[PDB]
Inverse folding.
């Protein structure tokens, strides 16, 4: 019930954020409209099926409901639906929900996949929006699967458990979520506020763990998306826990991230790289961090000397995403956002759009545009 001390860096050169122009309503509206043009085109391309995790030379392939990423496509549909109230979006996304209910009922391809990622933006999303009982059923069933049961994205995985607690009143859901927050905070964040890797090898035999992918350049580096899972997963958990130490841990992880952004404020795939490295960007890490900062700002005290800096930072990052990284070719299978990195070491989705990146980009847009009720 205590978070270990971490180093909180000062935000260096804060004027690089504070001198930016805030994103206007017209700017965000047009960014949304441009995204939805691509989404409506992709709707006829995927049908009742789903994009692959990442694009191939910037075009998604079509697949069934068997990856770790399928929920993020349904999430794009719900976000768009909240923008325009088009029942077509609702109809298609509810079909996805039905598919997710089937998938959890039959335990199809669940591996060790983050269940929050699969069920929150798809099923919990619909329950937020219209109270659909099947979406609720699918969500609780996934929470129960997670209960039977350390990576930093577990910070988003446990939001499923907080939802289950709220819906059931069963404190066991909450007890697990809270324990898992502190286990994650103390064991997968370094004392310098960098995120760190999970277990790659069996703790008894040293055997390579099955279905575990090396992320980040090295044991000594700072994987950008991992850092971002912290930046967003911490305030999400803070909503449900209200431990002020969580705000300090957020400032540590976020300042660490901001201080390693390059000139256009869009993270390289690993934070050890910046301008001149020749390394690919990971826009998805940046979109995720914008969402996390936006969320934390709902709670951060007015007297926090960095609050205004954070506000300008997320605007600076989102503006760069909209202006330099968002997709401009309205072609079947194109993503919302270019230049992400899925898995550098395995050579997958390197400098490709990815579906979680598209999701968090649209979520950031919707967050800025409206008072958005969280799926998480």
């Amino acid at each position: 019930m205590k978070i270990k001390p971490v180093k909180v860096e000062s935000i260096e050169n804060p004027k690089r954020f504070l001198n930016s122009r805030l994103l206007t309503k017209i700017e965000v509206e047009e960014a949304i409209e441009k995204a939805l043009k691509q989404l409506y085109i992709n709707i006829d391309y995927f049908g009742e099926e789903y994009p692959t995790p990442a694009t191939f030379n910037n075009i998604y392939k079509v697949m069934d409901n068997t990856e770790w990423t399928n929920g993020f496509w349904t999430g794009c549909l719900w976000l768009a639906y909240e923008y325009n109230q088009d029942k077509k979006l609702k109809n298609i996304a509810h079909k996805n929900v039905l598919s997710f209910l089937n998938r959890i009922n039959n335990r199809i391809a669940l591996d060790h996949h983050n269940l929050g990622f699969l069920y929150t933006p798809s099923c919990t999303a619909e329950y937020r929006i219209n109270g659909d009982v099947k979406a609720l059923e699918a969500t609780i069933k996934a929470a129960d699967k997670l209960m039977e049961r350390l990576i930093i994205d577990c910070l988003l995985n446990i939001q499923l458990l907080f939802f289950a607690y709220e819906q059931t009143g069963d404190e066991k859901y909450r007890q697990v979520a809270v324990n898992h927050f502190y286990a994650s905070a103390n064991n997968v964040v370094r004392d310098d506020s960098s995120a760190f890797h999970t277990f790659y090898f069996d703790p008894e035999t040293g055997e390579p763990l099955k279905g575990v992918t090396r992320q980040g350049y090295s044991d000594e580096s700072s994987w950008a998306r991992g850092q971002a899972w912290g930046i967003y997963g911490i305030p999400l958990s803070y909503r449900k826990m209200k431990d002020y130490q969580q705000i300090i841990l957020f400032k540590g992880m976020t300042n660490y991230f901001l201080n390693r952004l390059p000139e256009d404020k869009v993270s390289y795939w690993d934070l050890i790289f910046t301008d001149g490295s020749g390394q690919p960007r990971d826009t998805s890490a940046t979109a995720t961090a914008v969402c996390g900062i936006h969320e934390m700002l709902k709670y951060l005290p007015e007297v926090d000397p960095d609050k205004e800096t954070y506000k300008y930072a997320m605007h600076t990052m989102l503006r760069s995403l909209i202006e330099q990284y968002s997709n401009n070719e309205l072609i079947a299978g194109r993503p919302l956002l270019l230049h992400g990195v899925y898995s550098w070491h395995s050579g997958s989705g390197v400098d490709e759009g990815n579906i979680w990146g598209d999701y968090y980009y649209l979520e950031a847009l919707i967050r800025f545009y409206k008072d958005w009720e969280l799926y998480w």
Remarks:
- The radius of gyration is 19 Å.
- The longest helix spans residues 25-46.
- Residues 26 and 369 are 10 Å apart (CA to CA).
